[PDB]
Amino acid sequence: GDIKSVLLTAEQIQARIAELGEQIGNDYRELSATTGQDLLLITVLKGAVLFVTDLARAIPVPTQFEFMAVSSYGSSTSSSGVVRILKDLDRDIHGRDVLIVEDVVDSGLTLSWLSRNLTSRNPRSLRVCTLLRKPDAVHANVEIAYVGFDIPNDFVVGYGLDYDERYRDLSYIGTLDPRVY
Amino acid sequence: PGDIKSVLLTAEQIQARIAELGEQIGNDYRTGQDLLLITVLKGAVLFVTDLARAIPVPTQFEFMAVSSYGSSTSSSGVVRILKDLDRDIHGRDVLIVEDVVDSGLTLSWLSRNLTSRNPRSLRVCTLLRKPDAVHANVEIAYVGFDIPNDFVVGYGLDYDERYRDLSYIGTLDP
Amino acid sequence: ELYPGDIKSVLLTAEQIQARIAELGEQIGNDYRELSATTGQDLLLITVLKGAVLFVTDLARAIPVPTQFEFMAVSSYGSSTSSSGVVRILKDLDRDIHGRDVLIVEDVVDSGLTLSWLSRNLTSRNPRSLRVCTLLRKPDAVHANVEIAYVGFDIPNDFVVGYGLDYDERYRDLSYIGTLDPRVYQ
Amino acid sequence: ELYPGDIKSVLLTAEQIQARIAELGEQIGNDYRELSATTGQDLLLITVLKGAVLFVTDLARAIPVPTQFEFMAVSSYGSSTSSSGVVRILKDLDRDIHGRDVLIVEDVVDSGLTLSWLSRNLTSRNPRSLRVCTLLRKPDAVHANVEIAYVGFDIPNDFVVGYGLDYDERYRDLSYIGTLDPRVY
Ligand SMILES: Nc1nc2c(ncn2[C@@H]2CNC[C@@H]2OCP(=O)(O)O)c(=O)[nH]1
Ligand SMILES: Nc1nc2c(ncn2[C@@H]2CNC[C@@H]2OCP(=O)(O)O)c(=O)[nH]1
Ligand SMILES: Nc1nc2c(ncn2[C@@H]2CNC[C@@H]2OCP(=O)(O)O)c(=O)[nH]1
Ligand SMILES: Nc1nc2c(ncn2[C@@H]2CNC[C@@H]2OCP(=O)(O)O)c(=O)[nH]1
Ligand SMILES: [Mg+2]
Ligand SMILES: [Mg+2]
Ligand SMILES: [Mg+2]
Ligand SMILES: [Mg+2]
Ligand SMILES: [Mg+2]
Ligand SMILES: [Mg+2]
Ligand SMILES: [Mg+2]
Ligand SMILES: [Mg+2]
């Protein structure tokens, strides 16, 4: 069982993803025309891989994929969000129109740090699209242009999100019964 | 946009088989811990996301990034690992999820590589199978669709990192 | 001896290199002879693989204060690396450099483009201090805008190999630095 | 001097280490002499970061035949690393070793599990040859099943630091190899 409640059903998620796709799509409409390049989705492994595969199919504009793998350092990652790069971008993003695809944004320390990092590669444009936004996503030195859902503070799992590498494969997002934590 | 010459399999055709072998895979794996899907970036991310939701038993994700050496990865297997597995797979029930198997040289090497980590079991599930999965020799337990010898794109598959985001698989016009 | 015919002329002898490194060791040592007390942490040598491995191993032994190693591996992106300096990271630092006194150890600074990007990358991790120590500096480093506190040798614009420096992964194991005969170029 | 009151005793001095490497180099050089002729490629030194970095820089300078460098970076998975030797690859070889004459350069061989795992891994890339040279060998390496062609010193089982070898990332920069005062652990 260990699912205490269903926060967001599969139907609700896929409905808003098609919604975000249209919005993102017309904002970057005319890209493949003016620049000749596609909208580039950058995703940090691995909580947002389910989201990015669905989102890209919802975007009515040519879309490329790019993945990063990162790892925490320890006692200061929780303070500055500086994170270890295990897998960098395969391609350069110079003069590219880049959209960071996130699963959740809470502290936003890491996202803030990633933004500054990707900025140093000098892209043509850069903003963030998150599926879920927690109450305290108001701090984080980073503006989010696209938000899927504004969710409560309690820990959620499903649809890419995990607890000890579990529950990622669920089509819905929900909360765990505290007996598992 | 006038570059796709042929559509091989529509989005509906794809989702059906995935739900099919997904139920098939789920029953075969119905150790005490979850089934582990391993994918090599980037071509099979759309397949592994859809597949995992189709497999009716608990399923975990793990990704590898690899790179070519050139005159030998052409010659045979052995690729450069850019990103290794996050966790050790000893005693795990592992399913290699690939997009397409052609020469199968890279697949042959990874299988031999992943075997050395002592998994409890190791099988392969590919969405597409080209002319010649006969030439190589890793037992592919699951095949979505066996396709002819022409270059395909779509549904995660690319040509110079394009056309990955398309919901269907098709053929390119030169 | 090792590579008959490919080395046109010797630029820096093994003894020349070692003497300068012993000098660099004392100078750096005096500049950081304070860290054990005040900060409590060791001088951290960050080196990008792999032209400067021979240099950093000799240098670390020539520095009379406690010294730690960190290695990075990077890769070129293409014409973008040669324009902005941005490189693909293949191997990052094992540990965060927050509040650490950091000394970048380089083999050669020419255009200095990748060094510039790297230093900006490392600074964003808020080290306590950050400086650069190169073995060789070439004339085009004048237009690089990276400040180098420690320079082993200023040399001409000719292409050199030896002491960690390569051409197609060769000549790194030479105890001395020299120039290549054009028979090797083409 | 460098670490005032941390080193209990000196096991191997700098001069002793350099003297031993010099013979190792010439020995390896004699065995790989007909390389620049027969195959026409250089002896390839492969080192896992980062305990053996000082050793390979000196060794490559002590070997009288052309040698190239290759570096790997690995991480521990956990208890499986300590049982099977299998490690996470953080940094792989830059070039393929197909048809290469490869010498794995190690700092210390104790259990030899990761070394054994590495050997089998590199063997699968079809090298022309593959051997192991380590600076130090401990008594428990006899239980290891990997063959070691070249050994600098056989030492006791005591934990040593210096010359690349560490304790919590310190003492790598020592030119000598010594034993730690338990007032450090
Ligand atoms: N699966 C799951 N993970 C969560 C949740 N909230 C925080 N996290 C994670 C905590 N560390 C990273 C990640 O949040 C991203 P960040 O804004 O940088 O703090 C959650 O509800 N579900
Ligand atoms: N997008 C797309 N790529 C293809 C196709 N056939 C081969 N490929 C690729 C060529 N290099 C690797 C990959 O498959 C060969 P393998 O090593 O056996 O896995 C194809 O129909 N479409
Ligand atoms: N072996 C050897 N390599 C060299 C030489 N000059 C430049 N290089 C290298 C060219 N790519 C990196 C390195 O230049 C450093 P930088 O231009 O500042 O980024 C040289 O004389 N010998
Ligand atoms: N600094 C230092 N490290 C040591 C020592 N003995 C073992 N080690 C290490 C323990 N983990 C890796 C290495 O052992 C090599 P192996 O057991 O063959 O795989 C030692 O005397 N000093
Ligand atoms: Mg995320
Ligand atoms: Mg997680
Ligand atoms: Mg594939
Ligand atoms: Mg492809
Ligand atoms: Mg350099
Ligand atoms: Mg070089
Ligand atoms: Mg070792
Ligand atoms: Mg250590």
H helix or E strand, kind and range, residue C72: strand C67-75
How far apart CA B148 and CA B139 sit, in angstroms, is 19
CB D134 within 8 A of CB D165: no
Residue D176 has which token pair? 């000598």
Give B47 Cα–ligand 2 centroid separation in angstroms: 15
Residue C157 has which token pair? 């614009």
Task: Give strand ranges (E) for chain A.
Answer: 3-8, 39-44, 63-71, 84-87, 97-105, 125-133, 144-150, 156-157, 173-176
What number does the ligand 1 atom closest to the CA of A167 have?
1
CB C109 within 8 A of CB C85: no
Residues of A in contact with C86 (CB under 8 A): 92, 94, 120-122
* Cross-strand pairs, B128: B100, B145
H helix or E strand, kind and range, residue C53: helix C53-62
Catalytic-role residue among C42, C92, C101, C110:
C110
Q: Which domain holds residue A65?
A: 1-181
C window 66-95, beta carbon within 8 A of A: 77-78, 80-81, 83-84, 86, 88-90, 92-93, 95
Question: Which of C12, C16, C48 minimizes the C-alpha distance to C156?
Answer: C12
H helix or E strand, kind and range, residue D18: helix D14-31
How far apart CA B50 and CA B45 sit, in angstroms, is 9
Go through chain C and list every residue after which a break occurs, taking a C to next N gap over 2.5 angstroms, comma-separated: none
Ligand 2 close to Cβ of residue B153 (< 6 A): yes
Given an 8 Å threshold on Cβ–Cβ distance, is B49 in contact with A50? yes
- The number of distinct structural domains making up chain D is 1
Burial of D158 (0-12, 13-18, 19+ CB in 10 A): exposed
HSE-up of D2 (CA within 13 Å, CB side)?
22
Residue A34 has which token pair? 């003016």
Task: Give strand ranges (E) for A111-172.
Answer: 125-133, 144-150, 156-157
Question: Which of B173, B89, A36 minimizes the C-alpha distance to D84?
Answer: B89
How far apart CA B110 and CA B39 sit, in angstroms, is 11
Q: Is A15 on the interface with B (CB under 8 A)?
A: no
Q: How many CB atoms lie within 10 A of CB D168?
A: 9
Active site residue B132: no
Instruction: Provide DSSP, chain B.
Output: ---EEEEEE-HHHHHHHHHHHHHHHHHHT---S-EEEEEETTTTHHHHHHHHHH-SS-EEEEEEEEE--STTTTTS---EEEE--SS--TT-EEEEEEEEESS-HHHHHHHHHHHTT--SEEEEEEEEE-TTTTTS---EEEEEEE--SS-EEBTTB-BTTBSTT-SSEEEE--
Mutate to test the interface with A, among C41, C86, C90, C114 (most CBs of A within 10 A): C86
Handedness of CA B45, B47, B50, B51 (dihedral sign): negative
Residue A136 has which token pair? 């305290």
How far apart CA C157 and CA D79 sit, in angstroms, is 52
Handedness of CA A144, A145, A151, A156 (dihedral sign): negative
Q: Which of B6, B100, B138, B158 to mutate to test the pocket of ligand 2 (most atoms within 8 A of CB)?
A: B100
Ligand 3 close to Cβ of residue C160 (< 6 A): yes
CB C23 within 8 A of CB C132: no
CATH number, domain of D49, equals 3.40.50.2020
* Cross-strand pairs, B94: B36, B122
Between the two ends of chain A, the Cα-to-Cα distance in Å is 14
Ligand 1 close to Cβ of residue A156 (< 6 A): yes
- Report CA-CA distances (Å) from D150 to D9, D24, D46: 26, 7, 14
- Which protein residue's CA is at the shortest distance from atom 7 of ligand 3? C110
Q: Which residue of D has its CA nearest to C73?
A: D91
Cis peptide bond N-terminal to B42, omega within 30:
yes
Q: What sections of A35-108 are H helices per DSSP?
A: 49-58, 77-80
Question: Which of D32, C93, A164 minimizes the C-alpha distance to B61?
Answer: A164
Residue A27 has which token pair? 């904002």
D146 contact partners, CB below 8 Å, separation of at least 6: D112, D115, D116, D119, D132
* Cross-strand pairs, A132: A104, A149
Q: Which residue of C has its CA nearest to D33?
A: C2
Smallest Cβ distance to B46: which of A53, A90, A165?
A53
Ligand 2 close to Cβ of residue B102 (< 6 A): yes
Experimentally, the structure was elucidated by: X-ray
CB C171 within 8 A of CB D59: no
